[PDB]
Ligand binder design. Structure first.
Ligand SMILES: CCn1nnc(NC(=O)c2cccs2)n1
Length: 164
């Protein structure tokens, strides 16, 4: 079945709880597999220890730059970047999980979790999952963001992995 994965998130070293995500491998298998493997670390690199570097309330929480920690970096399990798989899934509401990019065919490791319907991103960012449990933890993360995206506490993925 579709992978079920988790992110355990801290703020300034204090646990906020766990976000559980379903990865829709039945629709975007290549994109789902990249995220799954970056959660387990099985390729020797991944999300463990990296940050939510940009968090904008009433928009989205962005993470996954485990190379430069500022939105300029990241890499996929396939190479530096990989193509846009498809745009079949849409940004339907809060809790959508989607890939960040710098234009067409620039997916790496950066991703975002929506806190509102971001339908204006449809057809430009590859959606690949959604929050199963822990939207309250996502709201905690959101509360440490700002309109510029700068966070008022250091938000870290303390641990991550796969549940099924
Ligand atoms: C919706 C969150 N998000 N997803 N992808 C992005 N990328 C950017 O904003 C930029 C990339 C390069 C210069 S700006 N943001």
């Amino acid at each position: 079945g579709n992978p079920l994965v988790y992110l355990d998130v801290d703020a300034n070293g204090k646990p906020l709880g766990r976000v559980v995500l379903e990865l829709k491998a039945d629709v975007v298998p290549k994109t789902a597999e990249n995220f799954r493997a970056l959660c387990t670390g099985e390729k020797g690199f991944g999300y463990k220890g990296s940050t939510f570097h940009r968090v904008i309330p009433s928009f989205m929480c962005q993470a996954g730059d485990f190379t430069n920690h500022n939105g300029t970096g990241g890499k996929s399990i396939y190479g530096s970047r990989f193509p846009d798989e498809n745009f079949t899934l849409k940004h339907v509401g809060p809790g959508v999980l989607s890939m960040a990019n710098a234009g067409p065919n620039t997916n790496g490791s950066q991703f975002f979790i929506c806190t509102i319907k971001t339908d204006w991103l449809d057809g430009q960012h590859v959606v690949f999952g959604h929050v199963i449990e822990g939207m309250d933890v996502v709201k905690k993360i959101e509360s440490f963001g700002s309109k510029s995206g700068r966070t008022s506490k250091k938000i870290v993925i303390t641990d991550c992995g796969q549940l099924s």
